[model samples]
Target: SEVAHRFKDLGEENFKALVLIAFAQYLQQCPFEDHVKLVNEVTEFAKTCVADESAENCDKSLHTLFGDKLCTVATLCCAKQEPERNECFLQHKDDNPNLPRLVRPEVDVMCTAFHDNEETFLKKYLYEIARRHPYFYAPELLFFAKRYKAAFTECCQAADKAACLLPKLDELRDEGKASSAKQRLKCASLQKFGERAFKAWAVARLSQRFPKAEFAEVSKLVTDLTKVHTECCHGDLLECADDRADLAKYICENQDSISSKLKECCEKPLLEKSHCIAEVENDEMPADLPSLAADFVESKDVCKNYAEAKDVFLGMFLYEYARRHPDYSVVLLLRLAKTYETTLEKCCAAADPHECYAKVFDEFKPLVEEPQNLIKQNCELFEQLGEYKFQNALLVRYTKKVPQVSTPTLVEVSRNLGKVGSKCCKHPEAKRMPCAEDYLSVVLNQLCVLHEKTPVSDRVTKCCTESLVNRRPCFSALEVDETYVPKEFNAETFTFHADICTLSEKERQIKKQTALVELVKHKPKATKEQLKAVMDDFAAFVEKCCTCFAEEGKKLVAAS
Candidate 1:
């Protein structure tokens, strides 16, 4: 009724387009039958409005087609001219406050309705699913609708229809719940973590696991996945679901573009392919990847190329650098790009831009080497000192800088530091440095965020407030907080278990690290020799038990 007068003023051709566009835009989540029904119903009402030039018939017809709430939007759209009016219709399609949330029907009720009238039951079923998820794409809704109808068809033939329907409905319900929950967690991560940081995380992860894939393809995958998170997080569930389907389709169809291992995953059935893709193992880092000594991009071309397209140029730089140095973690790679960007910014502004770029080659040396050196020192120390002592060393180094901070907090930071070193230092040289640098920086960053607002010391605030690239290096030269005194350190022991021998290698390593952390936390004052002796004894016992078990061909049994 609200837009009936406007519809009368529109010529027949314009009015038809308006009605078609409105239904097409609004009924995206509904079945094709509903789409046809609504479009025909609305077109007839519009023609009647034009013929009678009366609000009475129009109001009643519109109220029936779209309940009272949607009639206003349905008609209000016709008030505007074409093109503009189309957007008005499409934009407000999901803006209706009248749509209710999804509520699944009870097994008996659903079965009984289906048996009473199959056509009526199916229409209502699709309608119930569609209206609640107006933001979802037609294909996504249709897929679920097909599943619902299939379930009913198969169930209704059974002696006890409700019994047959219950499991199928429960399985579908669980899938929907889990999928939405996973999406929620993903969106939350994108919001809580900065986009660049998240992208970096994706790049490092994807690149490592799919090392044979070109960086260009890897970068695109990250960008596409990031878009899904960004849009879904903002409540555009239709586009999000639709995009996920397309991504999986493209990956499977273009098998050669991704890693061979990932291609194997894509060969599985649709749902299995997605699950397989998520858990696919990493490929070995490509042997032909660029070396650290080689320049990523020429220094001379930096300024002009950067001016042409800043992010593209930087991303190219990232792609080149990351592919070359497969060992560098995403955090470190991000730092590399950030460094290059700032350097270009400064050099391009100089009176002698070319010289500025060339001269800085020497400066970039330490920028890369310093982080390398830091990791080297860390791993070297970790190797020299056992895990427990390494953690003790970290506690001493950080506590002196922020003595006013709580002992528990500093202890946690120290434990985290030890954990990072232990986890990464165990890796082969090719992977170890990056792992250590990335996670060590993470621990330091966490420490900074923890104390940034409540300044424990001048050094803590000063470094915490420094930019990301400089913050870690700044923490290196920190001075002790003079006001605080040392606390007495307690001693503790690590007990051995027979089960350690039965565990998988990865589990065994993690369990050992946990034991070290517990020992360090409780026995911070334990001497390096004592820590080493305990570690050696534990290792010797595990080796002896494992050797005996293997030779005897019997399980090492222990009573609880």
Candidate 2:
């Protein structure tokens, strides 16, 4: 009768309400097979109702009709469907005094009544139950809420904490729970929410108690936790099912390793200066020397492991040898020179050559040369005719005339001269230079100027400047002042100003005269007035530099 009456004209919300009520009543009286049919009808009506309403209206309808009760009922039903139930399931009650008496005491009846009378039920019944009798439902609600919030915040945080904590607990319980390993692993992998909470709490506790621990240690722990958390969160059961017993055994055996290394790094010496000097003279360098030179030298006993520390010590010994004997034997010099060259090439290849060169020069100069001499010096004693004699000398020299050669170039020269020295030593009667040392010196001098002797083209400077200017305008005065000016300007103001102004004026003169000639040649019959105007423009160009240089020089002098 209802279907025949005004079914076609019923609004979607009212139609849905009627269908839900009818299905609920049908389920109460019908066999399980008929109940399935009623469920199918409700599902079909729900699908049509969803399709009929606009998205906004559909959302509103869901909020009004099934917002609180629907999810609760669905979860409860799914939980109860399993054949083996838990203690929590048996303890749950079905009493709702606010609900109508006609509604059956079954869980489904409460769900259906709420679905049918959602508007009145929510304000009067559902909210009251949630507010007053929160314990009955709050645990599940709280679990869902916290899980959702954490998932939104950073799903991995909670999971990682759990994963890290489980391993520690597993270690403690390993002996007693040997047979339950698979079960434990399954539990760890499934309990993502619990794990997340554990991790968060653990990290907070660690931060509070160990505020002064190294950041690197803390970071490592966090990273380990994150790795485990991610594994658990993604439900990787096999990873969790590891041999905890073996891990515990291994950790116990290696307990001393951690403490020993930490103490070696952190312990202090008996005497400060005396111990430092003695250590410096005898200390074995770290195996990771080149990589970790800037780091703290934690252990003097690095030398005890000779094989691992040999490279590091050889490198240091070579550096000291180069420092003490700047004009070292050609063989030793060439090796040092090659090292510097390789370093320079790598640095230049990776970044700006000028900047890299400056960096390398800063680091290398002190070790190999003095500020004024460009070679490090030391004194040595030798036996001289029943007496001791001493000579103080530089191992290397910086000849400004030859310009200071790099350490790598020196090393290369030394290598080549060593080959010649070996040959001279073998063939004593050879017509070549008698003293191998003298020949080696000549070879070193020759190698120093091997590239310098080739004369640079006289026209290169002029041609390069012209090409550059044609491609782009010369740097503007404003850009130079704003970006290129150094923080402090010192030196003889007149001398520095004159040198810079001379270079600038020279370039300007070349460009201005070149432009003037082009204009004159291209328009020979143009007015004298036009020719004078071009000359005036050229004069203005020169004036720009002179004026700026004068101002800068004044500023420098004033500051000084």
Candidate 3:
């Protein structure tokens, strides 16, 4: 009665019956004794709930029930594919004509649960559930496979049957309407199956198509497909499985055509024969060699000093030597620069200009002005001695002077002398010495003392007077006095005059107080009051002195 009453309340439209049925089926198949108590509680509650009388009620209840347990059952049954169990699961859907389809959200939950619980569910349950209820779970599964192809393949062995879902895929692709989440799931399931089957299919098909093609070429394509599949399925294995299949199919269909084209295009044969000789110019050479040589000659002409002449001449000599013996010339040139620097330093220091001239001329003139004679004389000796040995001999034979002091005393003697020496040394004739005055002025400032007995020079006197006039314009007189005298004077003979009868009362009072103070201190019988008064007067006088002192102190501070 309770079951009937509950069924009446629920009516046939309630899908709880279908959910309980599916859950009961799952429990029977999986058999978790731990869930028996919970199952029994749900069964008891279902019994008390009313079922709608309409078939739609049953369908709705069944769909609700199945949807609720879809994630759990998919995970649990991921490995198992017993036909009876699948049929039993399908029976609920088969009977419910008005059953609501699994939405994208539901498919997502199923796929995610399967992915998370794959280890627990194992491969068998995953493939079976994924394949049997591909419509319910495939879209998300395909998405998951495409995103995680490796994981997808690992779970479903989808790579084994790449062509398995091609028909469904083609149908979906060709279908004009947009796919619902349910249709997407269906497509994904088929794709996973097809991806594995298609890979194997592509290999066989390509091998058959290209029987004469190199195994390596065919194998390369296969390897490429595998790589592409792996990449495409990196995150979504199921989705990538489909893509890889498509790419592999394309490569398989085109391999023979490409090979045939290559073979047909190659027509060359072998062997060589002799022909008439023809000159081949050295194209890498600069086209302006004559102009470059002219420019180099012009550069040498522009050398105005020893340093410039040395650099240019050495460069020219090295260029010629390098043409004959490059490695030896490089070392020889470096040594030459070193020896030249030493010779230049020594030559620059020779105190006698003629000696410096002779030294530089003897070493360089023969090389520059008489190179032909020198070379002729030394050719045999140089050939026998070798490059480095010949260079050392030339360095010793060169007339180099000793090096001079860096800060020469002549530089301190006269500024002009130092300047002239610097200029002359750089000039072609470097033979002139600066004047004596120029030398002395650089080293010393002329000093003179002014005293009575010391006669002043006309120049010294003129300079001093000019300096004085410049300092003070008020000194208009400049006459020289030969005789000057001082007059004797006495301070005691000086006198002062004043109008004494015109003294004011204040002035007289001041004079009286001064006289009384001196008179009182000498009085022997002075009364205490008189004495006190005089003393008081004296105290007043002292006070007045102190006041004057204070006033002076204030004035002094204020002044400061």
Candidate 4:
């Protein structure tokens, strides 16, 4: 029951792995422990990670930092690392690399240059990498760093390097990356990309590898697949998921047909369509996608259960976004809701989703990129949440935990909300505004009505009519003005509830004695001394109760 939600929240891989690891360390048996005695300890390491997802996933290649069976090696220790250099052979085999070669031999050499010269060097290295080259800033950067770190550890622990060459490692890295390095920014020619654009991207990539005559054959064959998306998804992927689930299943069954068609069209000097497919895959991404953080993204939507997978991704994308940002401006909140709808419509179904909505990002960008812009461009922020909301935000930002908002703050908030609705009620821009000024008249009329309740005076009506905005400040002048006490125009302006003590002086003393006798009747076994003590206490109690009721009535009259 205590933090049981963690059990529900973690994904299967991490949750299962952590549970197994925890079982080994905290082995008191029963396979599960929930005793109060056991709960006294703070043992929750199982659910944690080396680093959080956003931080580590950026450079996803370096997760395999090997250790000497201790499993405590740091991840993020390397930079000059080759892709696909398996840490497994290093894990079990003694084929450990040139450990001795890992010295501070020379920073001039690129291989040894990635060495961890100091503990803080890790962060320094990653920072410099991102600074020099921005593509290294992606999620995979952390992974890339970790791989080299493990290699460094392997070198240090070996205490020797019989067969090692820094040059070989550097050369290997160069070769591996050249096969799949990276480059600069590019976008849709018209800031738009989808079926026709995607078709151009895929065909252009393969066309360069093959001559125009042979590439024409490939283009003809590529159209068979491109035509399917052009004719079907058009630009509405969200609807497509719901509409095209059957089509996905149909494609799944036709995998063999798809493979043969690509092979038929993809006659290459390299003579392979696999890498050609890679070109098409990269082209599918017209731009970076908005943050998508759900398992449904990984689900095999290629063929089967297309709607089932896409629906979950759409829902999570919406949920995660709204849940992450709070205290949004009224305009921004509505803008996000509209963005949510637009994103869902464009990206839910197309085979290449990024291309589908990439052009639209510029339009959605202004609404959420900076909330201050929203506050300024939309309605007056002072009017949106009001002075009280600013006070609450200030408290939350600067202070530690305490009662965040006072009853006074709450009352102010409520009053402001009422006034905001009234102003909004009358604004001509308010589309749903009434044909008649129903809300506006109600709000303005209530000022006089409230004034009349106390019949505060003709003075209040005069102050209100002085400038006819009839705004909150105008209506609330009496409530907030310490000097503007209502007049005692009517002597009958009084409350009726103070009657509880509307008794004779003689009856008041009698009431005290009545309480004393009532207590003694039930506690008759008490001694004389105790009875006298209780009688005195009861007298004070009755006087306090009467005073409280009197003050309550006085306050009620004063408030009115």
Candidate 5:
């Protein structure tokens, strides 16, 4: 009835043109008998509007043509009062039907049919393809239709028509088949998993997608999607289509709670709306969620939780852990959850379950932490040492550790690491570590993924594939790249200037870190023991020299 509200106030000429064009545009796609009948009925509406501009009968005919909801969309287009308004109406129309999967006709049979009435056969082909993928835009359908028509035209002219046409037709058929399969798989998962399990999966999914939104708020959107799945998965395709349309409407109306980014998606037609929402990236995680300790689940709920319901318990842990640690990447979070799940699977079967569970948290913590601390410490070194020096330090270290990797590749990786540190360490302390960990892990992951494309060393491959926690140590313990020949080691003694005795405490500390970076770069061939001895000697020199200045007010020079 509210369609009438927009129908009035359009001037009489405008009103007649709008209703006539809108009905013509929509009904033209219908069968000839129905299209003629609908157009005749709609002329009465234009006549009624002209006589008194009352939209009473016009609204009824519109609702009959477009239905209640899409009637709203049609009338809203009527409000536009432009020649292009019909185009607007076409663009916004939601007429996606549940067409049966297109069956591939035999090539000779299809070619005969095509030759009998080329125009009609191609028109029907375009109609079938367009309706099959209703979410596709008009331009996309036009190009796809042209591609099919071109393929058929050339293939039919070939001497071996079947040989040429069969493959082309199969290509077109399989394109639609893949999309149809994807939708069916989504439905099948819902049917196979049952509502309870599916609902839990939905909650976890929404929680991850809208990490900043309140749990209650995310759940409300999940409930809408789940209801659509539950009601329509067992029904025919149109039932799923219509319910998802309603879901899109609900999401549009409640955009604030769901996500503001959904506004553009809500304006999309039918399945496109759902597809758009699925592709939207996750929101930033909210601050001020509960903090988690390294030993957060150190208690005995591990066994009890596993005994009750394994996945549900694990799902809850992942949900809570994901919410708490905003800095954790999705890949790492999944790894953490997998580690926890397998640990419990083993421990829950043990004779002394609690004793077996003792190492669970310990096993998990390093996976979360080792790469984190590695990044943080490397970032600090990167900052203190500066970029050129940092890149040099990294090249020397990594080339020795994984010498089978080419020098150029090692240089490239080191520069990336240097860039991450240079960029991230400039932020204040609070922001610094998170930025560093995010980027440095990307650089490290390059090595892991690179091993697949190009083999470097056996140990490199071995360490790269190890589980997250173990891989860190495996990489650390790798024998020096035997193939890398080092530059001549500087045998000169490490020295301190007399002026260091008078430097301020902060200045003194800065000098020490610079000294250490230089020492490592200079003595690239030095053993860990040799490096430790040099550092210890330097520390003793600073202590004696600085104290002598404090007490006797004398300049000092020292060397390790």
Candidate 6:
């Protein structure tokens, strides 16, 4: 009490902040259950300091806490229950001078330590703060110091419960678990707590330190806490932080966890899922089979251009891929569907879809047998089977030897198949191949990772996820949808910096004109009619640009 009284003698702007330093020491040893007695001692300690040290310093002791934030601080000690004390602090949430400096950043630091599961480290940090942010440090009465300390434990517990939930889902996603909001959530509480802790530190320390630097910079500081980039809270970007070694240390230093993960992969049903990974050890190349779809061009008009335009048969796609060494699997299906997926409808006469398929298959199958007949007999297709085969071959080489994995690297490793009569099924060639489970999980895992990390608003980033992931380069399924046009696809956007905020209406209109004109001029094989329409659109867009800039110029003039 005497020690507390000595600190109470100091005013708020003077040595009063030193009371928190002493309070920190006391707080380390105090338990939550035994807080009231400590509160009472602190309340009694403030009374011992002279109430009227001088006429200038005499207390009014009215509704104002004597016109001092810290005097209001001592009143909390007089509150008997948690509800009243909480209400007192809530009333001062913004200018919480009673516990401002200590509550926000300090609680952030403490929670970080709690998440690290390291008490010794937290204790060391709390004691070392005076050497740290001396820019904001100030003294307070021990009673108020005690109240802030209690708030620290209470608020952070609730904060961590809410903040860590999504990232835990991200963890499961990175590991090949199907992305789902349902089912149970499983992850270390501390890691999630630590994520929030960094942001809290950002809020409490960095923002206060650099409030006017621009909110963009404030958010950037928190993202830099780790190598991974994800959009963070704009309202409280200060609430985020990271340490690279957290996950690395877990994977490397702890063989128990790593071993358990690998073992989980070996369990019977789970083993089937990992079979693709097991095949990574196999040096064997992929092989294909014969096309089964039959039927084709009997008409003269169809023979000239219609048949040549049709894409290859689906089953034969697997066969063509074999000569090239590998296949892109589901992505290959998308590519094959391009010309021929609609080919039968074009080639089929007043005939059955079934007869057209089988008959076309028989005719086309015999045609591909000779190199001299490589050209399509019925339809057009980027040079027909010849060009398609070359493109597919190139795609195969990329998926296998080159490994277009820049968008998702954590994908990682595979091998070892069961010998004959082993638990693995080998009768069917595909059954001998990697099980569908392992392969699909890997694809889906990377797909989700790309989706989660890529910038949704950035067209280039979106293209990588939506286009390349589906094996279609240079085109995105997302871009074709009307929902993306104004926001993403129309192409007038250029500058990538966040600080610029947004482009003016005039600037955006001009960009759209340039983008559209370039697109039409460069488009391959556009019909004369299509090109004419594109030109008309470009002319109108240019006219709009003229009108928009004139209005913006007037606005700028008015401001001047």
Best by TM-score: 1
Model 4, residue 191: distance off in Å is: 7.0
Q: Write the per-residue lDDT of candidate 2 for residues 1-560, one digit (tens) a residue.
A: 22212233343433333333322221222233332344345445455544554433333322223222332333422243222222222223211123322322443443455457644332232223222221221112222222222322342234454454344434433322221222222222224225433333223322222233233343344344444434322322112112221222332344233122222322332222212211222122223223222221223332332235543343333333333332333232333344444554455355454444444434555533321121111111112211110100001111111123332343334344334433443432222222333243334333423323332322222222332111111111111111111222224322233344466543543344333333433343445465555556445434454544456545533532
Please tell me which predicted candidate would have the highest lDDT against the true structure. 1
lDDT of each: 0.59, 0.31, 0.32, 0.34, 0.55, 0.31
Candidate achieving higher TM-score, 1 or 3? 1
Which run of 10 residues does model 1 get worst, by summed lDDT?
551-560
For every candidate, C-alpha RMSD to the true structure in Å: 15.3, 33.1, 48.3, 28.2, 24.4, 24.9
| Candidate 5 residue-wise lDDT, 55-97, digit = tens | 5544343333443323343332655433444445445433233
Model 1 segments more than 4 A misplaced: 1-197, 200-216, 228-249, 267-300, 445-465, 469-471, 482-560
CA lDDT, candidate 5, residue 41: 56
TM-score of every candidate: 0.48, 0.14, 0.14, 0.20, 0.39, 0.20
- What would the per-residue lDDT of candidate 6 be over residues 402-489, giving only the tens digit for each residue? 2222211211111111011122232233332223322332333333333334334343344434432232233212222222222222
Order the numbered candidates by TM-score, best leading: 1, 5, 6, 4, 2, 3
Q: In lDDT terms, how accurate is model 5?
A: 0.55
Candidate ordering by lDDT (highest first): 1, 5, 4, 3, 2, 6
Candidate 5 residue pairs in clash (backbone atoms < 3 Å): 400-481
Q: Which ranges of candidate 2 are over 4 A from the true structure?
A: 1-229, 236-248, 260-291, 294-348, 351-560
TM-score, prediction 3:
0.14
Better of 1 and 2 by TM-score: 1
Query: By TM-score, how accurate is candidate 1?
Result: 0.48
lDDT of 1 by residue, 440-558 (tens): 55666556645644565667777755555456678777756554444433322334456677787856655555544455444445565665555555455567765453432222222
Q: How far is 318's C-alpha from truth in model 3 (Å)?
A: 66
**Which model, 3 or 4, shows the larger lDDT?**
4
239 Cα displacement, candidate 2 (Å): 4.5
lDDT of 4 by residue, 533-553 (tens): 644554443455564545554
> Model 4 segments beyond 4 Å from truth?
1-126, 136-150, 153-165, 172-181, 185-199, 203-560
Which of candidates 3 and 5 is the stronger one according to lDDT? 5
